[PDB]
Design a protein around this ligand. Sequence first.
Ligand code: KRS
Ligand code: KRS
Ligand code: LYS
Ligand code: LYS
Ligand code: CL
Ligand code: NA
Ligand code: NA
Lengths: 517, 517
Amino acid sequence: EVEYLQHEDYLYRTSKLKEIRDLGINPYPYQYTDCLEVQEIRNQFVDNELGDSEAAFRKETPKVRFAGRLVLFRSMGKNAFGQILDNDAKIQVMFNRDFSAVAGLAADAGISPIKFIEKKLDLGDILGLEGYLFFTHSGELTVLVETVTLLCKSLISLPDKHAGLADKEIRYRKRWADLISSEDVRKTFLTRSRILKLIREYMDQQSFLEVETPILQTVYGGAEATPFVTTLQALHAEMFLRISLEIALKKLLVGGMSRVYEIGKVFRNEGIDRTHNPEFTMIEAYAAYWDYNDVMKCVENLVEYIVRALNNGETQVQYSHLKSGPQVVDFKAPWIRMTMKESISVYGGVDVDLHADHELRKILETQTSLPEKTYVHASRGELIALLFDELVCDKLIAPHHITDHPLETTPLCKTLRSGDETLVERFESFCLGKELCNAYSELNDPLQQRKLLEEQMRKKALNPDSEYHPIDEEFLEALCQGMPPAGGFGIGIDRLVMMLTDAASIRDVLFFPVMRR
Amino acid sequence: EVEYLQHEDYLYRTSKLKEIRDLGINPYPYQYTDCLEVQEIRNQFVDNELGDSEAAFRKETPKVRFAGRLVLFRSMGKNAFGQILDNDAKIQVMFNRDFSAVAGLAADAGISPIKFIEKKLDLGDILGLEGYLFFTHSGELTVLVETVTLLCKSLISLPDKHAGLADKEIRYRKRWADLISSEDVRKTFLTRSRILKLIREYMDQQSFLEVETPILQTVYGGAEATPFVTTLQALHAEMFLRISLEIALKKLLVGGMSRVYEIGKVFRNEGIDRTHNPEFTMIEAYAAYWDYNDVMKCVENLVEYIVRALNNGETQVQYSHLKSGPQVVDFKAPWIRMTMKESISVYGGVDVDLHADHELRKILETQTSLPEKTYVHASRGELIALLFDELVCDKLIAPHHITDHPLETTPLCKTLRSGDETLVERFESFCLGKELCNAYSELNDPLQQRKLLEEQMRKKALNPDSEYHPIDEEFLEALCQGMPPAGGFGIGIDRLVMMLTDAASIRDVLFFPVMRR
Ligand SMILES: C[C@H]1CCC[C@H](C[C@H]2Cc3cc(O)cc(O)c3C(=O)O2)O1
Ligand SMILES: C[C@H]1CCC[C@H](C[C@H]2Cc3cc(O)cc(O)c3C(=O)O2)O1
Ligand SMILES: N[C@@H](CCCC[NH3+])C(=O)O
Ligand SMILES: N[C@@H](CCCC[NH3+])C(=O)O
Ligand SMILES: [Cl-]
Ligand code: NA
Ligand code: NA
């Protein structure tokens, strides 16, 4: 059952509720008006020349109102000292038997203010503090409390501040306990919100318009993933949650919007690990009249701009959690640019074009651990893509753009303008061994687009494991209306946040990651 | 069965693909570099001192590059005039037999550049235009085209002008067609993106931090609605799509984040009509130490800010689509504020506290069309909400805050600080007869919170249509940890957009609304 309900701390704390109410005090009052943030008080008076505690007892120093969680308390007889935590900022408080009052505690109440503070309040309680600032002689900003208001009676103790492994697992669900206890977790999620704001700022200054498109669709596409399925009762209809943003934003290009982007949740019904949460956040952005080379500059300039805003103009970032040891990656533009075939020579030590189809298969079995079935009857392009996965991807620690993928890797990209129809003008961006961005010179030839989707459906998806998706005819009709030439990209925002906050796992950049029962 | 694949105009348009490629012209080229938006060109030269067509023929006026869809065209022998549509801006083009070249059309080809324009291009094609600006004699801004570039060969015609119900109904699905043909549709959606940006700007200015919380959860709550259900394969687990944002954000307040908001998709497996799409966008925002009066000011100030920013500082807006005829509504703060009982007197003609329960029932019986099951055994508070629904809600045309609802309307709100425990510190905002906002002095007494959820569970146990809905124990434990007093609101953004863009239906403010088969 619910275990804390029989814990001593809960039973003891709850028995104070009737005692506090019997004193005429509401332990869950309605507001605390006109109260500054602790951080704003610090900013306002940290270099100020405030008096000492005696100036505060004489009420000569500035008077403040603020609120927060009691996280430290020590009674010293006539005086008590404490620490209030407010929205990632801390400040010391001092209570005095003669100077401090408790809001709502009558003079003819049977308990003194200082004793109420010691006996009826607890660590974890949320308090409103009104009082006078001073500096200790060590320079610690402190508030001499004139009136303390109980704002919330907490019924369990503060979480353990320093979590072991088992507690850390629980706190991926009980995330509030992490946020109370850990400055580092608080900073991570503050940086995440800042990153999302920097993305919108950059896109807006490039004249992209932000839109929303449906998560629930009768189709799915724009990526290779098992979808989530659900039922819409009004129409008695099966619906898919989107696996990507691509098809919807391309229809808006046909609709005439030259630069669109969307930052949204997508859903891939796949595995859970350090880099995969089934619900994650993507940006996709499309710019008419661009190709993948324009997109490549846009993507690296976006990331460089975010890194500079977060790191005082510096472009270098430390990441600590690779198995190879702590690294420094420089996000300065331009990033390393290589074709896939080139990356296999440089990092895999294999010049792909000097080997025959059957010869490439022998390299796989000998130099990799892939199952024989993966490469036994794979086409040449698929064989190159597999050699990249196993011999190159993990060596891509510094930011890389990998260009010119085999046609097999996607049906939505134009082929190389040189006339080489076995490769597409695609790039994928990699950093710290993980994929960060996917981008195309977008396909807008409607007849070629149909042929590629038909050959992906029939020819490729006759594998017993693949879930049949029918050809998206509304998308082909939109292309017939006419989509401009365009360049588009998608970025896994959660993975970007990981690289910029030194997070070992995607679970560390999501408030509430998917968790087992 | 796709119809257009058998229509004459698709044969006529596709036939030109070979002819265009035989002339060495790629009809789906890769880019159009250094390409200004038509809107940018108008802003720089509409108020300029441009010359006439003869100055342009002398290549003395400003030279520009832009692109867009050919939406009008008329040949006059040596000269031809057309209209280019680019992201809701239009500009006239002039072609001339001797001045205009076609990109990639060799001199030794079998057709003249001007005849190529007439015979190989069509209304609907996307073109790149390079030429010289000038003013027609009537003052219309125009470009004398030096080089036209085919950027996309459209295979179907421009959408038709005459639309019945079925032709506009199809456009709710084929939205790209709607965007190309209707200036009002384009402006509605441009305005929508502006509104979202203004909401963020206002919330950030109030020091609210924007966060993301999960759509897929093991529970659902924070509103009354049937959820969507899906399956997460990796854990063999049933999941719910969220019906609101509330529980997750409250946990972040427990975590110590003073002010948070989220703008995100929620999903209610309910009916489809003018004000209901099963997937819709909400903002929810929570501020520690506020109550519902603080929230009320924040809500009306937020909307007034948006309205002034869109309407050159004006606060009045026209709305055309109510059955009572066109209204003007004024979003000027403060909005009209009324308790629910007051509104029932003012607008319903019933003074509820002068009546016994059975007289309230008799009123519902004779003055409304409710089925007898709805009220014959309803509690007094339930009867009051039904009197509001049936006699008041439709009449709230001007913006209203309706306050102090019966306790039965929600389990997540504090009762009146006056001590009247039959009513809660809730308000709902109404405009144009529709609910816009729901807001609370948030309940943070853990024992009271369990008690209200248990009472709701007891009441639902008597309705055979609702399945057992377990209490969210993690939420209760977070409240035991301690949530500050707080004020929170949720706004249906799609309904807000409807009111500020004179949209008859929620389907007019969603790019792709839910549609029957
Ligand atoms: C945004 C696009 C292109 C760039 C790589 C990125 C990888 C994407 C894969 C992916 C799959 C999945 O099931 C769960 C996830 O959390 C991710 C992810 O974070 O990153 O996808
Ligand atoms: C945002 C919260 C509080 C304010 C009213 C608002 C109404 C909400 C109801 C609702 C239910 C539904 O199934 C589909 C919908 O599109 C809406 C909606 O737009 O607005 O809900
Ligand atoms: N839909 C792609 C992102 C955009 C790729 C370029 N059009 C993905 O999920 O990877
Ligand atoms: N969760 C509410 C909105 C917030 C109400 C105030 N806590 C709803 O869906 O109506
Ligand atoms: Cl441990
Ligand atoms: Na009746
Ligand atoms: Na039931």
